C-alpha cells in the first residue's frame, strides 16, 4: 500500500567522410 | 610461521597505520588492529629490494 501510493549527426558524419576523403586523396 | 612473524617485525617490515614498528611486544588495540600492513619502504611492500638480491642481480 505504501508502494502503490509511490507508483503514480548526419552533418558530422558527412564532415568526417569529407575529411577521410581529403586524407585519402592526399595519401 | 610465528617465528617468521617476530623476525619480520624485528627487521623493520611491519608498520601500523604509517608508523614503522620495531617492537614485537606492541599490544595492538583494536582501533589499530585493522591497519596492519607491510611498509612503504619494504621489498614485500612497495619496492627497493634488498642488498642480497641486488648483489645477486649483478651477474656481469
Amino acid at each position: 500500500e505504501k508502494e502503490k501510493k509511490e507508483l503514480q549527426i548526419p552533418l558530422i558524419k558527412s564532415a568526417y567522410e569529407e575529411q577521410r576523403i581529403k586524407d585519402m586523396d592526399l595519401w | 610461521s610465528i617465528h617468521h612473524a617476530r623476525v619480520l617485525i624485528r627487521q623493520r617490515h611491519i608498520r601500523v597505520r604509517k608508523q614503522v614498528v620495531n617492537i614485537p611486544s606492541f599490544i595492538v588495540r583494536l582501533d589499530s588492529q585493522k591497519h596492519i600492513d607491510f611498509s612503504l619502504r619494504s621489498p614485500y611492500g612497495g619496492g627497493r629490494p634488498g642488498r642480497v638480491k641486488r648483489k645477486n642481480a649483478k651477474k656481469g
Binding site: 500500500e1 502503490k4 501510493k5 503514480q8 586524407d23 595519401w27 | 585493522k34 600492513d37 614485500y44
Partner: protein
C-alpha cells in the same frame, strides 16, 4: 594535364621478376604506409624484368610531397638512395506510467513467442509477439533500451515499451554482446573472425551512432561478459595477457601502472565508484597483492597482503561499501582446512581490513544491496547452509543463524530491503525458502519442480524461480515467489528459458518521499479503489 596530374618518380627501384613482384610491391607499400596509402601503382617492364622506376599516385599534392621528403636520403638495400618527386516523445515509458509494476522478459518455443510477459491481471494486455528479427532471446541493455538479436543477422536496437524498430548494427557471425548501464555503448563479439586488414573479433559500436567506437581482435574467451561502468567514464579492455584501459569511445590507454596492470586474473568496475580492484599471482617471496586504487590519481593507496594464499574471487557490496574476497585457500602452514574473507571498508576512513573465518569453504556469496545485513552461504551441494550476518557501520560482524541439514544455495536479492529469498534450485530439485529480517526466520516453502534460476525485480516486487528447456526435462511451469505465500505466477509456455526484469531509469529519488512512507494511516485508498474494480 587537368584532373589528378599526380604521376611521380621514385628512384632506386629494384629489378625483379613477375612472380616475386607481389612480395616486392608489398614491401614497397609497407614502406610508403608511414605517411600514405596506395590507390594506383604501376611499374615499367623491360624484357620481363623491371626497368628500375615505379610510381605512387595519390591524386592530391599534399601528402605526396610530404612522403617524398620522408623517404629520401635513406640507402635502401644497404647502399641505394631512393628519391621521390612529384523517440524521446515515445520511448522511455516505464518511470511515469500509471501502474508501476515491474515488467518481465518472455521467450517460449524459440521464436514462436518473442514478447514481454506482464505483471498481469490475466487480462489481454499486453498481448505481444515481435516477429522474426531474433532467434536466441529478447535481450536487454540495463537502461531498458533494447529488445535485441544475438545471431549472425546482427546486433539489433529496438526502442519503446511497445517494440518499435530503431536501429540495426553490423555483425556477421556474432557470438556475444556487452551492454552499458548508462545507455552509452554496446558491443558485439564474433566467433568467426574478420580478415587481418582490420583484425577484429571484438567489434563494438556506440548506442548513439550505430558505427564502431572501438574495434580489435579476440582469440580467447574465458566466461560470459570489455564491460561498461555505472557511469562509463572509464573502461577495461585487454587482449588476453593484459589489463589496460579503453576510454569512452577513443580507446585511450594511459601510461599508468595503476590503470594498466600486468598479468592478473580478475578485475571489475565498482558498484558505487570509478574504482578498479584485482588480484595478482604470487611471486616467490613477494605477496599476492590485491590493490585498492583510484583511476585518475595514478597511485596505489591501498594494498592488502596475505601470505600463503592460492586463489581469490571478488564480491563487492552492491552499493560499493564492502569488498569480500572468498578464497579456496587452506594454509600450507596449518593442516586446518579454513577460509577467510578480507573485508575492506572503502567509504569509512583509512580503509580498515577485517577478517572473518569459517570451518568450511563457500560455494556461493551474497552482498546486500543497501542493507546493514549480509548473507553468506557455505558448504557442498548436500550441505549448503546459509548464515545471515548483521554488519554494522562501525565495529565488527558476527553470525546470527546457522541451519543444519539445509540445501538453500540460490539467493535472489530484492531491491526493497529487509527480505531475502533462498532457493535450493540448482540441478537436483527446487527447494525455496524466504529469509526475513528483524527477526531472522525460516517461515515458508514454495514448491518448484521445473525451476533453475532465481532473480529479483528492480522495484522490490517479485523474486522469480523459472525453468529452462535445454538444461533439464519437460516438467514445465512458471512459479515466481511472492513474500506472503500468495501466488505470483501461473504460466506454462513450452521451451521457455527465463523471465527477468526489463530495467528502469536512474530514479534520482530523495529521502523526503521515503520519510512519508516512514509515517493504513495515509495508505488507505489503494485497497478500496481495488475493491470497486473487483466488483461484479
Amino acid at each position: 594535364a587537368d584532373g589528378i596530374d599526380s604521376v611521380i618518380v621514385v628512384d632506386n627501384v629494384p629489378q625483379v621478376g613477375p612472380d616475386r613482384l607481389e612480395k616486392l610491391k608489398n614491401v614497397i607499400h609497407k614502406i610508403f604506409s608511414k605517411f600514405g596509402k596506395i590507390t594506383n601503382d604501376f611499374y615499367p617492364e623491360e624484357d620481363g624484368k623491371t626497368k628500375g622506376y615505379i610510381f605512387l599516385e595519390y591524386a592530391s599534392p599534399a601528402h605526396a610531397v610530404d612522403a617524398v621528403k620522408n623517404a629520401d636520403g635513406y640507402k635502401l638495400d644497404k647502399q641505394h638512395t631512393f628519391r621521390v618527386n612529384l523517440d524521446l516523445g515515445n520511448l522511455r515509458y516505464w518511470l511515469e506510467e500509471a501502474e508501476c509494476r515491474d515488467q518481465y522478459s518472455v521467450i517460449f518455443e524459440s521464436g514462436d513467442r518473442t514478447s514481454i510477459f506482464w505483471n498481469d491481471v490475466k487480462d489481454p494486455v499486453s498481448i505481444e509477439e515481435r516477429a522474426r528479427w531474433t532467434e536466441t532471446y529478447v535481450r536487454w541493455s540495463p537502461k531498458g533500451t533494447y529488445l535485441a538479436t544475438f545471431h549472425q543477422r546482427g546486433i539489433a536496437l529496438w526502442g519503446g515499451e511497445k517494440f518499435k524498430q530503431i536501429q540495426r548494427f553490423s555483425h556477421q557471425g556474432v557470438q556475444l554482446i556487452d551492454f552499458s548501464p548508462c545507455e552509452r555503448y554496446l558491443v558485439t563479439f564474433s566467433p568467426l573472425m574478420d580478415t587481418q586488414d582490420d583484425p577484429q573479433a571484438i567489434i563494438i559500436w556506440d548506442i548513439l551512432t550505430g558505427h564502431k567506437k572501438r574495434g580489435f581482435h579476440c582469440e580467447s574467451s574465458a566466461h560470459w561478459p570489455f564491460k561498461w561502468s555505472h557511469d562509463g567514464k572509464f573502461f577495461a579492455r585487454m587482449t588476453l595477457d593484459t589489463l589496460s584501459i579503453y576510454e569512452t569511445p577513443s580507446m585511450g590507454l594511459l601510461d599508468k601502472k595503476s590503470l594498466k596492470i600486468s598479468g592478473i586474473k580478475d578485475f571489475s568496475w565498482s558498484p558505487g565508484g570509478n574504482i578498479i580492484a584485482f588480484w595478482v599471482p604470487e611471486d616467490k617471496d613477494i605477496p599476492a597483492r590485491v590493490t585498492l586504487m583510484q583511476l585518475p590519481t595514478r597511485q596505489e593507496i591501498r594494498v592488502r597482503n596475505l601470505f600463503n594464499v592460492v586463489d581469490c574471487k571478488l564480491h563487492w557490496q552492491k552499493n560499493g561499501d564492502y569488498l569480500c574476497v572468498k578464497v579456496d585457500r587452506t594454509p600450507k602452514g596449518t593442516q586446518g582446512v579454513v577460509t577467510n574473507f578480507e573485508i575492506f571498508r572503502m567509504r569509512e576512513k583509512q580503509v580498515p581490513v577485517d577478517v572473518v573465518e569459517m570451518k568450511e569453504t563457500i560455494i556461493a556469496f551474497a552482498w546486500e544491496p543497501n542493507g546493514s545485513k549480509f548473507a553468506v552461504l557455505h558448504g557442498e551441494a548436500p550441505r549448503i547452509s546459509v548464515s545471515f550476518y548483521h554488519v554494522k557501520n562501525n565495529g565488527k560482524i558476527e553470525l546470527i543463524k546457522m541451519f543444519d541439514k539445509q540445501q538453500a544455495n540460490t539467493i535472489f536479492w530484492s531491491p526493497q530491503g529487509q527480505f531475502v529469498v533462498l532457493a535450493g534450485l540448482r540441478s537436483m530439485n527446487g527447494a525455496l525458502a524466504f529469509v526475513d529480517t528483524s527477526d531472522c526466520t525460516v517461515m515458508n516453502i514454495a514448491e518448484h519442480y521445473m525451476a533453475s534460476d532465481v532473480e529479483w525485480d528492480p522495484t522490490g516486487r517479485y523474486v522469480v524461480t523459472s525453468v529452462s528447456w535445454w538444461s533439464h526435462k519437460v516438467d514445465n511451469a512458471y512459479w515466481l515467489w511472492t513474500f506472503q505465500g500468495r501466488l505470483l505466477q501461473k504460466n506454462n509456455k513450452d521451451r521457455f528459458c527465463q523471465l527477468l526484469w526489463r530495467p528502469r531509469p536512474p530514479t534520482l529519488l530523495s529521502q523526503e518521499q521515503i520519510k512519508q512512507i516512514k509515517k493504513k494511516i495515509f495508505e488507505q485508498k489503494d485497497r478500496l479503489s481495488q475493491s470497486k474494480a473487483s466488483k461484479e
